[PDB]
């Protein structure tokens with residue numbers, strides 16, 4: 001009918017005579033949102049003849065219906081409810097002002113690094129196709145840690161580990177450093193150009209033009225972090241040679257000094273840089289967020305730096321907060337300031353690779369180091385976020401690539417590695433059979449699924465687009481087909 | 496304000512008590528009904544003639560007819576050919592009555608590796624003409640009949656593909672291999688080509704996700720795969736070891752089969768009755784043939800294709816839509832055209848047989864190619880009577896007519912005759928910029944089909960109505976695809992896609 005995806009009709013009529021009602025809606029998960037107007041409920045023309053109105057409240061998560069009249073601005077009913085999808089809820093307001101919100105119809109219902117990379121790629125492809133249009137399979141509106149926020153950081157962690165592993169293997173093979181540097185620069189340049197040309201633009205609307213080309217993005221950031229980490233490791237590389245040896249940390253001390261100074265630079269630039277027409281050290285979403293007194297401030301210092309450097313037209317025109325906070329500005333999640341945190345996370349992946357490689361002959365030592373790093377990073381994350389998605393010093397935020405976000409995802413990745421390394425490598429109980437096929441063809445699978453996003457085996461016309469089940473089935477089938485394609489490529493040894 | 500290849504025609508009518516209407520038909524139409532271009536009202540008074548503006552096409556020729564609106568009497572007519580961006584003004588006044596056309600502003604318009612080189616040239620020409628070729632009239636497909644440069648890209652590809660099947664299969668058989676595995680590989684390759692075509696090439700996904708009710712089944716790659724399968728299976732079933740008319744006495748079975756198929760095609764085209772349509776029809780319908788048969792595109796071939804596949808599963812914008820104003824759907828890569836495509840692929844197999852049987856002696860190869868080209872040219876001249884629209888079977892791309900096959904095969908034989916000594920015997924030119932697509936045919940074709948809209952091959956234009964911009968963009972895209980083919984060749988990547 002007239003109900004879109006995840007909406008519930010709200011038939012509302014007033015059993016009163018001398019007040020004009022305007023229903024005001026505000027989703028619960030928002031931190032500080034101005035109550036947007038929803039409908040206008042007039043007075044009943046005669047006694048016993050209420051005037052009905054139709055509303056479509058978003059039922060993704062919660063709702064706070066606030067009602068105070070236009071004439072007097074005095075409350076009549078403010079109630080918090082959680083509507084269901086495709087429901088039919090009737091709000092009866094009457095004298096005793098009292099409201100009940102009756103319900104008409106019930107709403108409807110080594111090998112470990114490779115396995116981990118395959119898991120991250122499969123989840124990324126799933127959430128990129130839409131993830132069944134579920135609110136927990138899409139990027140969270142500003143602060144939040146939905147499932148789609150857990151894919152890219154793990155991929156960067158895995159790439160850091162693989163960078164260190166391959167660098168050590170090549171240096172042990174005996175190749176010179178200049179050839180390695182040339183190769184690293186070439187791969188980074190290729191990744192950047194691929195991201196700028198093939199992945200980021202959408203060519204169905206029309207041809208690419210400089211005035212409307214999106215420079216930063218996923219693959220550009222991936223290549224830049226690749227280049228930075230690989231060059232740093234190639235510069236400060238030492239031959240690989242326990243009981244509290246602490247060699248893996250003290251040997252790579254220049255890397256740690258550089259990473260710490262980079263993190264300090266990110267913290268200072270975010271929390272101290274004076275943004276014109278915006279409070280210094282802003283972390284909010286702008287738009288209607290923070291009670292709506294900051295209309296154009298999305299991203300704070302990072303957003304301002306990105307807009308100044310690349311222009312407001314070369315960024316993402318539909319940021320992840322544009323669906324909830326109604327931000328009218330453009331903000332790329334893969335901006336310029338977040339590259340520092342991405343580099344830090346890739347270096348944490350390098351650290352995991354160092355732990356894996358140094359103590360190759362003692363599994364107990366590897367597990368102890370992994371769990372110690374996981375505990376330390378988890379403690380840092382808990383201290384920073386104050387175990388809350390809104391409060392705390394630095395909230396976990398994907399768009400800003402917050403330091404708490406990096407530390408939390410590093411904790412999760414270290415725990416995942418602590419689980420995966422024994423079973424897949426040491427015990428060999430389960431080789432990650434359905435997963436590592438993209439683990440060996442990451443970049444090819446990503447580029448292919450971006451190019452072939454719209455083709456028949458991955459997309460087809462559905463009976464009703466306003467249904468979660470059909471979208472979920474289509475996305476699952478597409479991801480399974482990409483797993484099968486990666487398997488076929490692996491069998492033919494096309495790397 | 497003006498479109499591309501469209502002059503501006505201003506009519507100044509000094510007549511007093513006669514409404515004036517004009518008509519226009521392209522000089523390239525065989526029999527086209529005139530269409531209303533513009534209506535010029537009578538002048539309210541002497542000295543202030545009524546002026547009306549209209550845009551006239553320019554791609555090729557123009558014939559105008561001036562008729563009275565009420566009395567339906569012809570006043571005057573012209574055969575002037577306009578310019579791309581002109582300002583021609585037409586004045587008609589009573590003197591009998593004569594109309595003079597004036598120009599206000601002048602227009603502004605002024606292994607063997609020989610098979611590999613052939614296939615590379617055909618592929619590059621195909622990629623150029625698919626991107627548009629500058630929107631030129633002779634770089635696009637012919638309207639219904641005739642032979643433009645864009646019509647020669649595909650038949651040469653099918654010819655060389657057939658020759659390559661023969662060469663590769665005879666090499667494999669000579670080296671030693673079972674026939675069952677070969678037939679299985681051929682079937683897999685044909686099925687893969689058909690599926691690739693249907694899923695990737697034919698449908699456009701930007702307008703929306705694929706819907707089964709509007710899926711175009713026939714197309715270039717499905718036809719390629721079907722003829723590949725048929726000709727490869729025939730030549731594999733009848734394959735004798737290599738050892739003077741010794742290249743036909745060893746091939747008479749498949750020759751008889753090809754003659755049977757050609758006879759079947761001729762019978763179906765010229766004899767199969769069609770409901771509400773003249774038997775043995777070839778005209779484009781619409782306004783062609785004086786508009787007596789509106790929905791009769793292709794005739795027998797169109798009717799058979801529509802009956803077997805349905806109107807929804809066809810090419811909705813055929814080549815004749817722009818000129819002959821037809822509403823029905825006709826797929827150029829239909830079902831009856833597959834017989835002639837098979838015949839041309841078999842002719843390519845015959846050319847490969849000629850090239851292989853006399854590999855030692857080059858004089859014999861050259862005389863064989865000369866004889867084949869001359870015989871096919873004579874057959875084409877007899878069939879088409881040397882005219883675009885006359886003759887028994889005019890050269891037709893959409894129908895894949897027999898004259899089309901004979902003419903394009905004679906041209907392919909002559910091109911092979913020129914290329915073979917140059918690339919092999921004398922070694923003057925080694926196909927340096929062309930044979931990399933000759934090695935990566937299918938990969939390059941599918942890549943350019945998928946990446947047609949991407950930036951290096953297509954970007955926003957400064958002036959969308961300039962031929963120069965489109966030509967530069969298409970040439971740059973084709974050069975980039977040559978470069979990509981060369982890079983793939985250097986990295987030893989080859990025909991696996």
Ligand SMILES: *[C@@H]1O[C@H](CO)[C@@H](O[C@@H]2O[C@H](CO)[C@@H](O)[C@H](O)[C@H]2NC(C)=O)[C@H](O)[C@H]1NC(C)=O
Pocket residue numbers: 518529560561562566567568569
């Ligand atoms: C313009 O007028 C001329 C003459 O009146 C038309 O020529 C004849 O048209 C009738 C029917 O309209 C045909 O039966 C004749 O065969 C035509 N030729 C002759 C010599 O009589 C002409 O058709 C008119 N233009 C258009 C577009 O209809």
Ligand SMILES: *[C@@H]1O[C@H](CO)[C@@H](O)[C@H](O)[C@H]1NC(C)=O
Pocket residue numbers: 018019020042043071
């Ligand atoms: C309520 O609204 C109606 C029209 O919507 C208006 O005529 C009436 O005056 C309003 N009542 C008050 C008290 O403003």
Ligand SMILES: *[C@@H]1O[C@H](CO)[C@@H](O)[C@H](O)[C@H]1NC(C)=O
Pocket residue numbers: 024035068073074075
């Ligand atoms: C409801 O009343 C509060 C004050 O208690 C006010 O801030 C708010 O704007 C009112 N809602 C409206 C006017 O929609």
Ligand SMILES: *[C@@H]1O[C@H](CO)[C@@H](O)[C@H](O)[C@H]1NC(C)=O
Pocket residue numbers: 001009011088104105
């Ligand atoms: C919701 O319930 C009311 C109660 O009768 C009904 O009239 C209305 O049609 C229902 N909504 C829809 C969309 O059917």
Ligand SMILES: *[C@@H]1O[C@H](CO)[C@@H](O)[C@H](O)[C@H]1NC(C)=O
Pocket residue numbers: 512513514536537565
């Ligand atoms: C020419 O067309 C005009 C416009 O309708 C009309 O008034 C006039 O009568 C026409 N001329 C003749 C001779 O009918």
Ligand SMILES: *[C@@H]1O[C@H](CO)[C@@H](O)[C@H](O)[C@H]1NC(C)=O
Pocket residue numbers: 503581582599600
């Ligand atoms: C054609 O000439 C007329 C009068 O000379 C002028 O008004 C008109 O703009 C010209 N059109 C073009 C396309 O030059």
